[PDB]
Structure formats: C-alpha cells, structure tokens
C-alpha cells in the first residue's frame, strides 16, 4: 500500500 506523508512516499 502506497502511503504519502507530507509529500514523502513510502510502502506499508
């Protein structure tokens, strides 16, 4: 699941 936190991309 692609997550975007304040512009930063990560996979969780």
């Amino acid at each position: 699941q692609l997550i975007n936190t304040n512009g930063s991309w990560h996979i969780n």
Epitope: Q1, L2, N4, G7, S8, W9, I11
Partner: antibody
C-alpha cells in the same frame, strides 16, 4: 512487447468532461502502479495522478484534485482518467506512464510512457 | 513546492564529445532523482533512477551522480541519436520535474 495505447483525446468545450483510456499489453498489468502526466510547451512536464496495486489507493496533484479521477480495470488491462470541469489551461499532451513498481527496489519513477494523446479545451 | 533547476538551458556539442548536464534542487531530495530523454514527437524515456542507477536497455555511456541538492547526468561519448531534450525528476517531496536541457548539434 510492452505497450500503453491511449485514446479518448480530442477537442472539448470548457466546463465539459472527457475520459482518457490507456490499454496495456505485454506485461502483467496487475503488478504495476500507473500514472497520468501531462506536458505543455510553456509549463513542461506535470505529474497529475497515481494509482497503486489496489483500486482505492490513489493520490493527485493539487491542480486537478476534485476534478480528475484515476481508476483501473485490471480485467481489461485498462487505466482511465475521468476529466471533469475542464479549463482552457488543461489543454495539453496527456501521457499514461508505468511506475517502476518496486522492480529493483525502486518506486515513483516512470519506467515506460505511452505516446500520449492531445486534449484541446476550447470553445 | 520543491523546485528543480536544470543547467545549462542549452548544451551545444558534437558526436564523440562528453556531455555534462546539471540539476539543482531547492532543498535536499537525498538520492530521490531520475533523468529522462525526449525527442520531438515522442514520449519520454527513463535513463537513470535513484540518482545513479541505469534503467533497462540504456547504453553504458549514460551515468548519473549526486545527492542532496546537486546532481549530474553524464554522457561519456555522444552518438547522433543522443541529441534531444533531457529532464530531471524528484520523488522526495511529491513529484516534480526540471524545465529541461536542450542538447543540440554544434556547428
């Protein structure tokens, strides 16, 4: 051979809607995130939207949020962009693009682009 | 909001010469940077991702370096098929592109 064939482009009046399509072939569509990106001579390349492995996993640029909706139909290997409330400034070449999608541990880069389709918003 | 600035705007060279293209970020993007090539009438092609990794099918003469705010795309020895527009892209803070560098044949 990897292909991303686009359609749906054309002339549309301001305030009306268009739906763009991108049909993929030559790879396992289900396993890739996908993006729409547009280009104009004056503003250059502008990322618009991404959809990840799951249909509900989406993000948008501020410039199109609330007006454009990205979606995927895996059964037909097709990516869509529903474009509502169109403005003159939405005139552009529209590209569908495949995300590298964790291949070689990388993501959020555009590893394959379709030929693009021209949308002209005019009265 | 995070802006990328490419230089020079235009680069004039001949086949056989070394090409050096630059990309500077307004703030740090770590190694979260990619380079693309585009010829008139065609779609972009990915060259380099994560600052220094060469993409599939891309000839060894292309390479990338840098981190933080300063990055470089090098083409070791130019071929005629290499003249084109080159763009940078970051994915540290959302997604943005540079304005492009035109690589043209010198005469």
């Amino acid at each position: 051979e990897v292909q991303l064939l686009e359609s749906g482009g054309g002339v549309v009046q301001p305030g009306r809607s268009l739906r763009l399509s991108c049909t993929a072939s030559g790879f396992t569509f289900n396993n890739y995130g996908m993006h729409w990106v547009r280009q104009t001579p004056g503003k250059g390349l502008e990322w618009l939207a991404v959809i990840w492995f799951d249909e509900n996993n989406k993000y948008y640029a501020d410039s199109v949020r609330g007006r454009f909706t990205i979606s995927r139909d895996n059964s037909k290997n097709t990516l869509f962009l529903q474009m509502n409330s169109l403005k003159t400034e939405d005139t552009a070449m529209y590209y569908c693009a495949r995300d590298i999608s964790l291949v070689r541990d990388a993501f959020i880069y555009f590893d394959f682009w379709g030929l693009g389709t021209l949308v002209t918003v005019s009265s | 909001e995070l802006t990328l600035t490419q230089s020079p705007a235009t680069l004039s060279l001949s086949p056989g010469e070394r090409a050096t293209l630059s990309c500077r970020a307004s703030q740090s993007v770590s190694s979260y940077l990619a380079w693309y090539q585009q010829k008139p009438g065609q779609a972009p092609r990915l060259l380099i991702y994560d600052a220094s990794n060469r993409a599939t099918g891309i000839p060894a003469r292309f390479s990338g370096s840098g981190s933080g705010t300063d990055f470089t795309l090098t083409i070791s020895s130019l071929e005629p098929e290499d003249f084109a527009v080159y763009y940078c892209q970051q994915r540290s803070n959302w997604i943005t592109f540079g304005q492009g560098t035109r690589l043209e044949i010198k005469r």
